[PDB]
Design an enzyme around this catalytic site. Structure first.
Site, PDB file in Angstrom:
ATOM      1  N   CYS A   1       0.977  -1.326   0.114  1.00 19.20           N
ATOM      2  CA  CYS A   1      -0.001  -0.262  -0.006  1.00 19.20           C
ATOM      3  C   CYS A   1       0.795   1.262   0.034  1.00 19.20           C
ATOM      4  O   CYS A   1       0.515   2.007  -0.659  1.00 19.20           O
ATOM      5  CB  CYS A   1      -0.969  -0.051   1.320  1.00 19.20           C
TER       6      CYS A   1
ATOM      7  N   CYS B   1      -2.119   1.410  -2.642  1.00 19.73           N
ATOM      8  CA  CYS B   1      -3.184   2.764  -2.434  1.00 19.73           C
ATOM      9  C   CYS B   1      -2.396   4.153  -2.600  1.00 19.73           C
ATOM     10  O   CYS B   1      -2.922   4.710  -3.400  1.00 19.73           O
ATOM     11  CB  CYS B   1      -3.402   2.880  -0.772  1.00 19.73           C
TER      12      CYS B   1
ATOM     13  N   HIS C   1     -27.308  20.202   3.619  1.00 19.86           N
ATOM     14  CA  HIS C   1     -27.320  20.712   2.301  1.00 19.86           C
ATOM     15  C   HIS C   1     -26.271  21.843   2.338  1.00 19.86           C
ATOM     16  O   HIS C   1     -25.813  22.695   3.059  1.00 19.86           O
ATOM     17  CB  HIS C   1     -28.762  21.391   2.265  1.00 19.86           C
TER      18      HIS C   1
HETATM   19  C1  LIG Z   1      -2.832  -1.328  -7.459  1.00 16.51           C
HETATM   20  C2  LIG Z   1      -3.146  -1.792  -6.095  1.00 16.51           C
HETATM   21  C3  LIG Z   1      -4.063  -0.772  -5.498  1.00 16.51           C
HETATM   22  C4  LIG Z   1      -4.490  -0.897  -4.256  1.00 16.51           C
HETATM   23  N1  LIG Z   1      -5.252   0.085  -3.748  1.00 16.51           N
HETATM   24  C5  LIG Z   1      -5.719  -0.094  -2.218  1.00 16.51           C
HETATM   25  C6  LIG Z   1      -6.508   0.845  -1.629  1.00 16.51           C
HETATM   26  O1  LIG Z   1      -6.935   1.837  -2.024  1.00 16.51           O
HETATM   27  N2  LIG Z   1      -6.914   0.632  -0.227  1.00 16.51           N
HETATM   28  C7  LIG Z   1      -6.719  -0.650   0.427  1.00 16.51           C
HETATM   29  O2  LIG Z   1      -7.153  -0.605   1.587  1.00 16.51           O
HETATM   30  N3  LIG Z   1      -5.784  -1.512  -0.165  1.00 16.51           N
HETATM   31  C8  LIG Z   1      -5.565  -1.255  -1.488  1.00 16.51           C
HETATM   32  N4  LIG Z   1      -4.558  -2.200  -2.110  1.00 16.51           N
HETATM   33  C9  LIG Z   1      -4.234  -3.421  -1.227  1.00 16.51           C
HETATM   34  C10 LIG Z   1      -3.504  -3.310   0.097  1.00 16.51           C
HETATM   35  O3  LIG Z   1      -2.161  -2.530  -0.223  1.00 16.51           O
HETATM   36  C11 LIG Z   1      -3.239  -4.718   0.722  1.00 16.51           C
HETATM   37  O4  LIG Z   1      -4.473  -5.224   0.935  1.00 16.51           O
HETATM   38  C12 LIG Z   1      -2.236  -4.659   1.865  1.00 16.51           C
HETATM   39  O5  LIG Z   1      -1.068  -3.952   1.638  1.00 16.51           O
HETATM   40  C13 LIG Z   1      -2.048  -6.107   2.556  1.00 16.51           C
HETATM   41  O6  LIG Z   1      -1.535  -6.120   3.726  1.00 16.51           O
HETATM   42  P1  LIG Z   1      -0.299  -7.204   4.066  1.00 16.51           P
HETATM   43  O7  LIG Z   1      -0.211  -6.972   5.592  1.00 16.51           O
HETATM   44  O8  LIG Z   1      -0.545  -8.444   3.503  1.00 16.51           O
HETATM   45  O9  LIG Z   1       1.052  -6.509   3.380  1.00 16.51           O
HETATM   46  P2  LIG Z   1       1.801  -6.391   1.780  1.00 16.51           P
HETATM   47  O10 LIG Z   1       0.914  -7.137   1.099  1.00 16.51           O
HETATM   48  O11 LIG Z   1       2.017  -5.075   2.462  1.00 16.51           O
HETATM   49  O12 LIG Z   1       2.949  -7.481   2.590  1.00 16.51           O
HETATM   50  C14 LIG Z   1       4.036  -7.360   3.542  1.00 16.51           C
HETATM   51  C15 LIG Z   1       5.653  -7.229   3.118  1.00 16.51           C
HETATM   52  O13 LIG Z   1       6.241  -8.615   3.223  1.00 16.51           O
HETATM   53  C16 LIG Z   1       7.228  -8.802   2.067  1.00 16.51           C
HETATM   54  N5  LIG Z   1       7.495 -10.220   2.053  1.00 16.51           N
HETATM   55  C17 LIG Z   1       7.024 -11.370   1.135  1.00 16.51           C
HETATM   56  N6  LIG Z   1       7.361 -12.407   1.444  1.00 16.51           N
HETATM   57  C18 LIG Z   1       8.487 -12.215   2.231  1.00 16.51           C
HETATM   58  C19 LIG Z   1       9.383 -12.862   3.158  1.00 16.51           C
HETATM   59  N7  LIG Z   1       9.493 -14.127   2.699  1.00 16.51           N
HETATM   60  N8  LIG Z   1      10.096 -12.601   4.129  1.00 16.51           N
HETATM   61  C20 LIG Z   1      10.072 -11.251   4.183  1.00 16.51           C
HETATM   62  N9  LIG Z   1       9.359 -10.269   3.706  1.00 16.51           N
HETATM   63  C21 LIG Z   1       8.270 -10.989   2.710  1.00 16.51           C
HETATM   64  C22 LIG Z   1       6.527  -8.153   0.810  1.00 16.51           C
HETATM   65  O14 LIG Z   1       7.504  -8.033  -0.382  1.00 16.51           O
HETATM   66  C23 LIG Z   1       5.791  -6.656   1.425  1.00 16.51           C
HETATM   67  O15 LIG Z   1       6.979  -5.755   1.494  1.00 16.51           O
HETATM   68  C24 LIG Z   1      -4.292  -2.106  -3.447  1.00 16.51           C
HETATM   69  C25 LIG Z   1      -3.329  -3.011  -3.796  1.00 16.51           C
HETATM   70  C26 LIG Z   1      -2.865  -2.908  -5.108  1.00 16.51           C
HETATM   71  C27 LIG Z   1      -1.734  -3.804  -5.789  1.00 16.51           C
HETATM   72  C1  LIG Z   2     -26.178  33.105   3.536  1.00 19.54           C
HETATM   73  C2  LIG Z   2     -26.892  32.132   3.912  1.00 19.54           C
HETATM   74  C3  LIG Z   2     -26.656  30.779   3.686  1.00 19.54           C
HETATM   75  C4  LIG Z   2     -27.332  29.505   4.278  1.00 19.54           C
HETATM   76  N1  LIG Z   2     -26.396  28.408   4.095  1.00 19.54           N
HETATM   77  C5  LIG Z   2     -27.160  27.134   4.285  1.00 19.54           C
HETATM   78  C6  LIG Z   2     -26.569  25.991   4.012  1.00 19.54           C
HETATM   79  O1  LIG Z   2     -25.563  25.783   3.547  1.00 19.54           O
HETATM   80  N2  LIG Z   2     -27.446  24.598   4.443  1.00 19.54           N
HETATM   81  C7  LIG Z   2     -28.819  24.912   5.151  1.00 19.54           C
HETATM   82  O2  LIG Z   2     -29.390  23.742   5.433  1.00 19.54           O
HETATM   83  N3  LIG Z   2     -29.426  26.107   5.007  1.00 19.54           N
HETATM   84  C8  LIG Z   2     -28.485  27.183   5.018  1.00 19.54           C
HETATM   85  N4  LIG Z   2     -29.343  28.238   5.158  1.00 19.54           N
HETATM   86  C9  LIG Z   2     -30.579  28.411   5.752  1.00 19.54           C
HETATM   87  C10 LIG Z   2     -31.910  28.131   4.628  1.00 19.54           C
HETATM   88  O3  LIG Z   2     -31.631  29.114   3.705  1.00 19.54           O
HETATM   89  C11 LIG Z   2     -33.238  28.214   5.654  1.00 19.54           C
HETATM   90  O4  LIG Z   2     -33.091  27.219   6.523  1.00 19.54           O
HETATM   91  C12 LIG Z   2     -34.457  27.903   4.388  1.00 19.54           C
HETATM   92  O5  LIG Z   2     -34.433  28.693   3.463  1.00 19.54           O
HETATM   93  C13 LIG Z   2     -35.619  27.813   5.310  1.00 19.54           C
HETATM   94  O6  LIG Z   2     -36.771  27.392   4.889  1.00 19.54           O
HETATM   95  P1  LIG Z   2     -38.172  28.261   4.708  1.00 19.54           P
HETATM   96  O7  LIG Z   2     -39.061  27.431   3.805  1.00 19.54           O
HETATM   97  O8  LIG Z   2     -38.394  28.973   5.769  1.00 19.54           O
HETATM   98  O9  LIG Z   2     -37.836  29.588   3.318  1.00 19.54           O
HETATM   99  P2  LIG Z   2     -37.138  30.818   3.073  1.00 19.54           P
HETATM  100  O10 LIG Z   2     -36.575  30.849   4.329  1.00 19.54           O
HETATM  101  O11 LIG Z   2     -37.122  30.071   1.734  1.00 19.54           O
HETATM  102  O12 LIG Z   2     -38.623  31.473   3.298  1.00 19.54           O
HETATM  103  C14 LIG Z   2     -39.825  31.678   2.212  1.00 19.54           C
HETATM  104  C15 LIG Z   2     -39.866  32.834   1.287  1.00 19.54           C
HETATM  105  O13 LIG Z   2     -41.023  33.492   1.281  1.00 19.54           O
HETATM  106  C16 LIG Z   2     -40.955  34.770   1.349  1.00 19.54           C
HETATM  107  N5  LIG Z   2     -42.226  35.373   2.142  1.00 19.54           N
HETATM  108  C17 LIG Z   2     -42.204  35.952   3.518  1.00 19.54           C
HETATM  109  N6  LIG Z   2     -43.555  36.533   3.658  1.00 19.54           N
HETATM  110  C18 LIG Z   2     -44.206  36.197   2.375  1.00 19.54           C
HETATM  111  C19 LIG Z   2     -45.542  36.354   2.243  1.00 19.54           C
HETATM  112  N7  LIG Z   2     -46.113  37.043   2.918  1.00 19.54           N
HETATM  113  N8  LIG Z   2     -45.877  36.190   0.800  1.00 19.54           N
HETATM  114  C20 LIG Z   2     -45.085  35.699   0.035  1.00 19.54           C
HETATM  115  N9  LIG Z   2     -43.855  35.387   0.300  1.00 19.54           N
HETATM  116  C21 LIG Z   2     -43.598  35.596   1.356  1.00 19.54           C
HETATM  117  C22 LIG Z   2     -39.664  34.817   1.807  1.00 19.54           C
HETATM  118  O14 LIG Z   2     -39.103  36.219   2.313  1.00 19.54           O
HETATM  119  C23 LIG Z   2     -38.706  34.020   1.186  1.00 19.54           C
HETATM  120  O15 LIG Z   2     -38.477  34.397   0.042  1.00 19.54           O
HETATM  121  C24 LIG Z   2     -28.448  29.690   4.680  1.00 19.54           C
HETATM  122  C25 LIG Z   2     -29.156  30.910   5.050  1.00 19.54           C
HETATM  123  C26 LIG Z   2     -28.307  32.203   4.426  1.00 19.54           C
HETATM  124  C27 LIG Z   2     -29.088  33.442   4.692  1.00 19.54           C
END
Ligand SMILES: Cc1cc2nc3c(=O)[nH]c(=O)nc-3n(C[C@H](O)[C@H](O)[C@H](O)COP(=O)(O)OP(=O)(O)OC[C@H]3O[C@@H](n4cnc5c(N)ncnc54)[C@H](O)[C@@H]3O)c2cc1C
Ligand SMILES: Cc1cc2nc3c(=O)[nH]c(=O)nc-3n(C[C@H](O)[C@H](O)[C@H](O)COP(=O)(O)OP(=O)(O)OC[C@H]3O[C@@H](n4cnc5c(N)ncnc54)[C@H](O)[C@@H]3O)c2cc1C
Ligand SMILES: NC(=O)c1ccc[n+]([C@@H]2O[C@H](COP(=O)([O-])OP(=O)(O)OC[C@@H]3O[C@@H](n4cnc5c(N)ncnc54)[C@H](OP(=O)(O)O)[C@@H]3O)[C@@H](O)[C@H]2O)c1
Ligand SMILES: NC(=O)c1ccc[n+]([C@@H]2O[C@H](COP(=O)([O-])OP(=O)(O)OC[C@@H]3O[C@@H](n4cnc5c(N)ncnc54)[C@H](OP(=O)(O)O)[C@@H]3O)[C@@H](O)[C@H]2O)c1
Lengths: 486, 486
Positions: free
Chosen positions: B50, B55, B463
């Site tokens: 890995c 990895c 959201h």
């Molecule tokens: C292309 C690729 C992508 C991968 N991507 C991921 C990923 O994204 N996420 C993930 O979790 N896993 C991934 N893996 C797998 C992960 O790396 C292995 O599952 C993990 O390394 C296995 O653990 P291990 O302890 O068996 O060690 P290795 O398999 O790490 O084995 C340990 C070491 O002992 C050595 N050895 C062998 N025989 C002897 C000996 N007789 N005496 C002494 N040393 C020896 C080896 O050569 C090696 O250096 C990937 C593998 C490949 C091939």
């Molecule tokens: C800068 C900013 C960033 C935010 N970021 C997030 C975020 O990342 N994630 C998240 O989950 N929430 C976020 N929020 C909060 C989110 O926008 C509110 O929780 C959500 O809009 C509330 O739902 P509501 O239905 O009360 O509507 P609004 O709050 O959507 O209220 C309803 C609409 O009706 C209008 N209205 C009022 N009275 C009347 C009427 N008498 N007649 C007609 N229309 C009327 C209002 O002025 C408004 O346009 C953020 C708010 C702000 C200000």
């Protein structure tokens, strides 16, 4: 029973439209009303709601621009022939973003037109029981009646009340469509919206400053919040601690003009001034529940917060009137939840569904330069609930393999869970600061809905080489002092 | 009495994990790792398959292909980065290698720090508790230990045809080729074959894939085909039902000119064509033959090479254990090799009664369009619970990020498999899209918790994140409703 519509939905946003589409799916004759009242500067938009137009979508998209920029840097070390001649075009960007927004507006408008849901671009207003006044764009008013009503009006950006704020400043509402590049800007606030925006503006190559009244991301795990801030600072975003703007003057005018912000500390009598091209106020939002005639039908609302109290079925004090989304009280202001409430509400009303919306452990992720995903109790809140000596935190840094050859930001990404010892080390808190935080968090949020326990977590085999895997084998706790700096 | 408490054969994923763990308990351990050269001379450092030729190098190069794609995107987001940018094969390799180099050495410092003896020699059993350690220059040495752990892993397998070992390369040689492969042919259809073909193509090369039968045998075939289609849709050419009968050297040089001739699996047809490089990704054979397993009497499936083992990774010989790929009927993955290794040690020297759980081990293939999965495949789901007891909720999704770059819509796909006779238990998870692994990890934990369709639906999605699509799966294959309208 012979009203105009089976259900009239006020607000065509995340919840409104979700509700509308469900109900319709059951024949119920529904009608949605949506109207966008322009911002103090004149900004307005199409059907869709906060997120679709001035929220998530545009936000995440611009955040992708900042990310793509960073990728251009990484491509080099991987054998790509690209220079640092990586200059950004704010208009060209906004142009794409807005265009995509156009499509969504039409998509949403067409989903309804084809779902047998009437859409009227008019401002709704209750005038009396089961009666609503629909004021259109040109003043023409019309009156409709329905067996049931769903309030889903959401909220809008708040102001400071200080001089010049409405005349020279912009909010999230104006930001995503600015005709000109913001230039050096100041971001007032420290909510996720504030930080997210500051971050991508900075990531797009701008000079950004953040004025914080008290703390960052008040509400979230503060340990995480600080790490998010430090990363931001470490990258150029400047922070001004414990200060609030008192005035705003237009030194010079012109697309990005010259603003003269004045502000003053809290704790002290100290006062300072600075200059910027743009000033984005991200100090929260106020529910749109005041000016809709809730009196004429008698719906009680927390007169103070503007929030609407609701039963565990999103029902108000008035049996034929319900509320969904942000305007709700002690719920969760998020697009995905607004749609669940909307869709499940409809299912209960017209399909005999007895399923209620679960607002517990709703996963979430802040799209700052270094994304932060989370689900469940924060650390401070975990102790405040189960007692400091009953929770163990397992944390560790991690390195996105994608970052090794570009050779940057080691021991920066962080992860941690919170377990409740008195309950099989139940995973009651999940936090991750790193790339693709959301993608990583989703699945775990499902695990919590299943009562994920530390034992089960350990027994899960991680995927190599993927960030997330860091969570399947964590043993260093906070109550052990062990240093995790590798 | 014995020289060591435990001698580990093989310094790879499992070996080192076992060594590091066991040592943590004052046990006198020693690791033997020797990398037998490739048919063409390629060799490498400590770390296993890995780290060097698995990895790590694989994922990294896959990132190069990704970064390239990002360079394309940047343009539509407002970055002035000319379409068409050249890639440097040599530059990239030099960078990957350096990273692997850093690692080789790293692990070196890992063992020594934890007082684990590392000998760069080839191990061989000569008699009970006795092993011959042949060093690099032929000098042999003999050691004895109370216990032995076999963790030798596997190596690439050749076809057996003329010219294959003399003109072809394997995964072993690929990650350090001194020259750019040029137009190449990839023989095989395993994840290794496809992953490599994919990034080579993504790096700008002319790639062709020769398939004996089907793609990714063992994986949900529906997914496999989608992965192939995406690859084909992007330029990777496929040759169906053909096997290389012989490869001849039309010329030599760094990028050489080889001729390949293969014949049908169907007819008699015989075909040929010029190719600069020819990679044989047709599986691997366990390194269990040439290690003197006889002298100690350890039984192995003489046919497959794998080593049968108890549910505690114990062989028929009580003082000898086996871990990792060489194992029989398990999962050949790095993360599992480390668990087996680490838990085995804990059981042997810490009284741990915890066994390694090879069930529902999550996995993800890094093709151009990443494929993450965990649990039963579709075909296997029916083959187990009966076609009429399993539901397939599926759906396409389009990562927000591709909206403005306006590419590949209705391509990303997700689907779960539920067992009706058991509360619609989620027994199969599949996702084709970006960051597949990051998305899959969390869900794999959910399955370890018995995630059910009801629980899944009750989970609120994040959201706007790709993963969310799973929190609302409603269209099932059986309710033969088109989803291809996204
Ligand atoms: C292309 C690729 C992508 C991968 N991507 C991921 C990923 O994204 N996420 C993930 O979790 N896993 C991934 N893996 C797998 C992960 O790396 C292995 O599952 C993990 O390394 C296995 O653990 P291990 O302890 O068996 O060690 P290795 O398999 O790490 O084995 C340990 C070491 O002992 C050595 N050895 C062998 N025989 C002897 C000996 N007789 N005496 C002494 N040393 C020896 C080896 O050569 C090696 O250096 C990937 C593998 C490949 C091939
Ligand atoms: C800068 C900013 C960033 C935010 N970021 C997030 C975020 O990342 N994630 C998240 O989950 N929430 C976020 N929020 C909060 C989110 O926008 C509110 O929780 C959500 O809009 C509330 O739902 P509501 O239905 O009360 O509507 P609004 O709050 O959507 O209220 C309803 C609409 O009706 C209008 N209205 C009022 N009275 C009347 C009427 N008498 N007649 C007609 N229309 C009327 C209002 O002025 C408004 O346009 C953020 C708010 C702000 C200000
Ligand atoms: N606070 C919580 O625990 C919490 C948790 C979940 C949901 N909520 C919801 O959020 C509501 C709070 O209002 P909100 O949604 O508009 O904003 P918010 O998301 O709660 O807070 C944004 C943050 O707003 C700043 N802020 C607010 N008024 C300001 C002012 N006048 N000047 C400068 N900075 C100011 C805060 O400063 P400070 O540093 O002084 O806070 C901080 O930067 C609640 O009523 C509830 O509906 C709150
Ligand atoms: N039948 C089996 O292969 C088998 C049997 C017992 C156990 N296993 C388990 O599966 C693991 C993986 O097996 P593996 O390393 O053999 O390969 P693999 O990863 O299962 O498969 C690689 C794939 O190899 C191709 N392939 C194999 N021999 C080929 C040849 N002579 N010419 C052209 N293509 C060839 C396959 O074609 P096809 O799809 O046409 O095969 C396919 O492309 C084993 O280590 C073991 O744990 C597999």
């Amino acid at each position: 029973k012979s009203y105009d519509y089976d259900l009239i939905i006020i607000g065509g946003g995340s919840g409104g439209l979700a509700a509308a589409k469900e109900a319709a799916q059951y024949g119920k004759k529904v009608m949605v009303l949506d109207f966008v009242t322009p911002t103090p500067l004149g900004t307005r938009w199409g059907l869709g709601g906060t997120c679709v137009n001035v929220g998530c979508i545009p936000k995440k998209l611009m955040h992708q621009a900042a990310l793509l920029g960073q990728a251009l840097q990484d491509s080099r070390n991987y054998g790509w022939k690209v220079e640092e001649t990586v200059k950004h075009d704010w208009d060209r960007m906004i142009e794409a973003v807005q265009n995509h927004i156009g499509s969504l507006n039409w998509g949403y408008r067409v989903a309804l037109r084809e779902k047998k849901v009437v859409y009227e671009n008019a401002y709704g207003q209750f005038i009396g029981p089961h009666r609503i006044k629909a004021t259109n764009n040109k003043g023409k008013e019309k009156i409709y009646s329905a067996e049931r009503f769903l309030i889903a009006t959401g909220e809008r950006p708040r102001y400071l009340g200080i001089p010049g704020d409405k005349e020279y400043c912009i909010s999230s509402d104006d930001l995503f469509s600015l005709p000109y590049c913001p230039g050096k800007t100041l971001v007032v606030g420290a909510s996720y919206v504030a930080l997210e925006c500051a971050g991508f503006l900075a990531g797009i190559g701008l000079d950004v400053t953040v004025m914080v009244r008290s703390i960052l991301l008040r509400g979230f795990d503060q340990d995480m919040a600080n790490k998010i801030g430090e990363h931001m600072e470490e990258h150029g975003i400047k922070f001004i601690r414990q200060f609030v703007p008192i005035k705003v003057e237009q030194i010079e005018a012109g697309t990005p003009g010259r603003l003269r912000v004045v502000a003053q500390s809290t704790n002290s009598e100290e006062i300072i001034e600075g200059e910027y091209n743009t000033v984005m106020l991200a100090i929260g939002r106020d529910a749109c529940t005041r000016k809709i005639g809730l009196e004429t039908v008698g719906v009680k609302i927390n007169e103070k917060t503007g929030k609407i109290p609701v039963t565990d079925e999103e029902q108000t004090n008035v049996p034929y009137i319900y509320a969904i989304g942000d305007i709700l009280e002690d719920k969760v202001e998020l697009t995905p939840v607004a749609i669940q409430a909307g869709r499940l509400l409809a299912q209960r009303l017209y399909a005999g569904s007895t399923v209620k919306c679960d607002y517990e452990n709703v996963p979430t992720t802040v799209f700052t330069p270094l994304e932060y995903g989370a689900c469940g109790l924060s650390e401070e809140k975990a102790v405040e609930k189960f007692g400091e000596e009953n929770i163990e935190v397992y944390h560790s840094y991690f390195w996105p393999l994608e970052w090794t050859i570009p050779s940057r930001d080691n021991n920066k990404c962080y992860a941690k869970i919170i377990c409740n010892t008195k309950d099989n080390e139940r995973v009651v808190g999940f936090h991750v600061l790193g790339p693709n935080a959301g993608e990583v968090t989703q699945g775990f949020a499902a695990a919590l809905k299943c009562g994920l326990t530390k034992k089960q977590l350990d027994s899960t085999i991680g995927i190599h080489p993927v960030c997330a895997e860091v969570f399947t084998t964590l043993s260093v706790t906070k109550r052990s002092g062990a240093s995790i700096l590798q």
